[PDB]
Design an enzyme around this catalytic site. Structure first.
Site, PDB file in Angstrom:
ATOM      1  N   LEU A   1       1.598   4.017   6.797  1.00 41.71           N
ATOM      2  CA  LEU A   1       0.467   4.317   7.765  1.00 41.71           C
ATOM      3  C   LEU A   1      -0.022   5.664   7.458  1.00 41.71           C
ATOM      4  CD1 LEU A   1       0.700   1.577   9.760  1.00 41.71           C
ATOM      5  CD2 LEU A   1      -0.854   1.389   8.462  1.00 41.71           C
ATOM      6  N   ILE A   2      -1.616   5.698   6.819  1.00 40.02           N
ATOM      7  CA  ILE A   2      -1.998   7.402   6.496  1.00 40.02           C
ATOM      8  C   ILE A   2      -3.316   7.068   7.329  1.00 40.02           C
ATOM      9  CG2 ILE A   2      -2.408   9.050   5.318  1.00 40.02           C
ATOM     10  CD1 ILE A   2      -0.906   7.966   3.145  1.00 40.02           C
TER      11      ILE A   2
ATOM     12  N   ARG B   1       8.499  12.712   4.262  1.00 40.96           N
ATOM     13  CA  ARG B   1       9.371  11.803   4.939  1.00 40.96           C
ATOM     14  C   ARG B   1      10.301  10.264   3.937  1.00 40.96           C
ATOM     15  NH1 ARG B   1       6.349  14.379   7.804  1.00 40.96           N
ATOM     16  NH2 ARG B   1       6.988  15.173  10.314  1.00 40.96           N
TER      17      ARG B   1
ATOM     18  N   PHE C   1      13.152  -0.271  12.021  1.00 44.25           N
ATOM     19  CA  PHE C   1      11.857   0.575  11.780  1.00 44.25           C
ATOM     20  C   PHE C   1      11.213   2.020  10.920  1.00 44.25           C
ATOM     21  CE2 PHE C   1       8.322   3.067  13.599  1.00 44.25           C
ATOM     22  CZ  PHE C   1       6.980   2.530  13.653  1.00 44.25           C
TER      23      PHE C   1
ATOM     24  N   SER D   1      -9.911   7.474   8.050  1.00 45.33           N
ATOM     25  CA  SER D   1     -12.078   8.283   9.406  1.00 45.33           C
ATOM     26  C   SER D   1     -11.449   7.199  10.678  1.00 45.33           C
ATOM     27  CB  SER D   1     -13.083   8.723   7.965  1.00 45.33           C
ATOM     28  OG  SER D   1     -13.238   7.475   7.976  1.00 45.33           O
TER      29      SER D   1
ATOM     30  N   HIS E   1      -8.357   1.872  12.721  1.00 40.98           N
ATOM     31  CA  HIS E   1      -7.971   0.665  11.681  1.00 40.98           C
ATOM     32  C   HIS E   1      -6.849   1.491  12.245  1.00 40.98           C
ATOM     33  CE1 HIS E   1      -6.602  -2.515   8.714  1.00 40.98           C
ATOM     34  NE2 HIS E   1      -6.529  -1.197   8.522  1.00 40.98           N
TER      35      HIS E   1
ATOM     36  N   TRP F   1       0.858  -0.854   0.266  1.00 38.70           N
ATOM     37  CA  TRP F   1      -0.346  -0.334  -0.110  1.00 38.70           C
ATOM     38  C   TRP F   1       0.614   1.316  -0.408  1.00 38.70           C
ATOM     39  CZ3 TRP F   1      -4.337  -0.838  -2.241  1.00 38.70           C
ATOM     40  CH2 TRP F   1      -5.371  -2.066  -2.325  1.00 38.70           C
TER      41      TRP F   1
ATOM     42  N   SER G   1       0.837  -3.377   6.101  1.00 40.68           N
ATOM     43  CA  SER G   1       2.021  -3.194   7.218  1.00 40.68           C
ATOM     44  C   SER G   1       1.142  -3.892   8.336  1.00 40.68           C
ATOM     45  CB  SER G   1       1.597  -1.940   8.307  1.00 40.68           C
ATOM     46  OG  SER G   1       2.186  -0.847   6.916  1.00 40.68           O
TER      47      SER G   1
END
Ligand SMILES: Cc1nc2c(=O)[nH]c(=O)nc-2n(C[C@H](O)[C@H](O)[C@H](O)CO)c1C
Lengths: 158, 158, 157, 165, 158
Positions: free
Chosen positions: B81-82, B127, B113, B85, B88, B17, B51
């Site tokens: 990971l973003i 990033r 990490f 809503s 999760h 993803w 992830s």
């Protein structure tokens, strides 16, 4: 890559709260797994009452299958958690997610995370492909594919 | 210090993803490791769907490499990971982070990490050093350096 | 009570982000243990790049020390985390803290929690005794004292 | 009927050895929590020479300190039946409060299976000093009662009801 | 499915705070299990001082039972936590929930999660079925039903 699930036995174990949404998630996991070759009689479906029962439920499901000579290659615990007015949502989600993650080393097969942790019912519906608006897609299909890929790429035989 | 990475074998395993971001982070780790003397052929790349799959992926990935006589000295799981809503994001992030930290004692090598846990896509682009305005730097490069340092300084031989 | 620290070997291992604050914390830890009688040559300092590396770095630091016949009695991992705009601060902090706690039972020596978990730079500076107003004492000093007391009072001997 | 209903019985503490181990920050609160735990246990029959007190500098040290305390007591032939780790944590302006609290709580919980005795959760996790003074029964207004006494009672009951013998 | 609880021995272990709500939760679990066929003489009730003591009380409860030849098939720890003005609520709830989840592998029977984690007393009374306007239902009943099902379906024996 294109993963062939024809040699896999896959377990799905689902909770029974939010049944309509559960049934949509489980359906999409099934459809997608069959599409990638898993045989119909090799998709084993078990149930438990609540999401908290998923981890111990999954461990014992896997042990039972192995004992009868029909080991699972992978398990998909599925549950739907919707925030209520108490902190119940947070404590079930937290302890359940962590125990699903830690189960993998106990039973030595991958375990797919099929818990929805939604703030609303509508969010849960969209994540199962069953909102009025059809605004996202059925996440259960993602879980079925991931079950096939993880079992194939990382199983004991691999 | 300068750490000589010429003797190391290093695994990268990444989720799929947010792929464009992932590739840039992956590419950053490889380049930095290549500049510390790690050999191209000694960098092994594997993938998993999400992830949440990273930690068990990383375990099985290390075991497989050891079993064919090509053991990893260190592994760098990478996922992006973003926040969406629902919760999760929180629940994946936290259980995946703890499982990455704890994996080190199961496989006895450092695990670097490499998860981004962003509130917005733009934070994630910055990033990976690929936002429009190049406002930060590619964290992949930090992961790459840290993998060589931790393998060398703390590798099974002193 | 007074804890004599003359028979102790103490490891300090620290991350390298926020270096000025790091150096001030480590110096306070060392200054206080010197004054509790720990000897200079029995204070061993190691580094790692990021706080996340502290718990595994500390484990291998202790193992390596024990393996060459110079075991640590106590270890002080030290890192400085400052909230940024993503959740990276929270995930590193939470998982590093728990793993520093769980580390003690694996290596069988106390491990002193030397991790700042600050919302701003100025908080971290203050906790290192180096904000402009000198509003707080250097927390590294407390870590040094705690290392001597925990090793003395709760050591295998 | 079942096993149940409500009797509110006292538990006899007189065969018990109890360890109290406390942090030293917020000393005045700490001292009042300890004294209450000691007083209630003396009232339940625990003998004074069987209450052992030890200290550590801060709350993060309570878990390993409690482990080594119980191990030392057993090694000299004076095992503990139950331990009460006591610390007072008050929210400051960083997230130190939260990281210390959470990882300390979880390690006090997990400690019980390692040393195989109950461990009473004697940690205050307050947002304000006033909250902490009240729960040690020493705010101006004496608005509550000393939670220390509850810890002492809880200790005597857990050791008695769930002890190896 | 229909569950026959007549072979089961079930333990209930409850904290002492908010006694009136605890008692209603406990009676709801017992009544439910009775109607599933568990016998009165095979329901054993134990008490601890507070919710924190539940996990270790449960562990020792199950071990004492097994040692005198009357092992539990499932245990239902029950507690009622209500947010106050300190962080006590969050710390007890979190560490207790995780420890109840993790207890199951230590004693090798299912453990049903009977903690209320409420923001207000009113929420707690509603979830034990004893609020003024009877707005929800007694969750103690779901726990009883869960204990019977998990014990039957996932017990050591079958
Ligand atoms: C403040 C508090 N609140 C509750 C509660 O709402 N429900 C409950 O069941 N128990 C509570 N306790 C007691 C703790 O669970 C525990 O007994 C003590 O902190 C001693 O370990 C405490 C201490």
């Amino acid at each position: 890559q294109n993963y062939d699930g024809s040699k896999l036995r896959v377990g799905i174990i689902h909770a029974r709260w939010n049944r309509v949404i559960i049934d949509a998630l489980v359906k999409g996991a099934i459809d997608r797994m069959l599409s990638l070759g898993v045989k119909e009689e090799n998709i084993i479906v078990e149930t438990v009452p609540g999401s908290f029962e998923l981890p111990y439920g999954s461990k014992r499901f896997a042990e039972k299958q192995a004992k009868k000579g029909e080991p699972l290659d992978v398990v998909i615990p599925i549950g739907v958690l919707i925030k209520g007015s108490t902190m119940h949502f947070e404590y079930i989600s937290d302890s359940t997610t962590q125990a699903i993650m830690n189960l993998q080393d106990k039973i030595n097969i991958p375990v797919i995370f099929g818990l929805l942790t939604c703030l609303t019912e509508e969010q849960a519906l969209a994540r199962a492909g069953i909102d009025e608006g059809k605004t996202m897609h059925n996440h259960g299909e993602d879980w079925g594919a991931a079950a096939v890929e993880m079992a194939t790429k990382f199983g004991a035989n691999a």
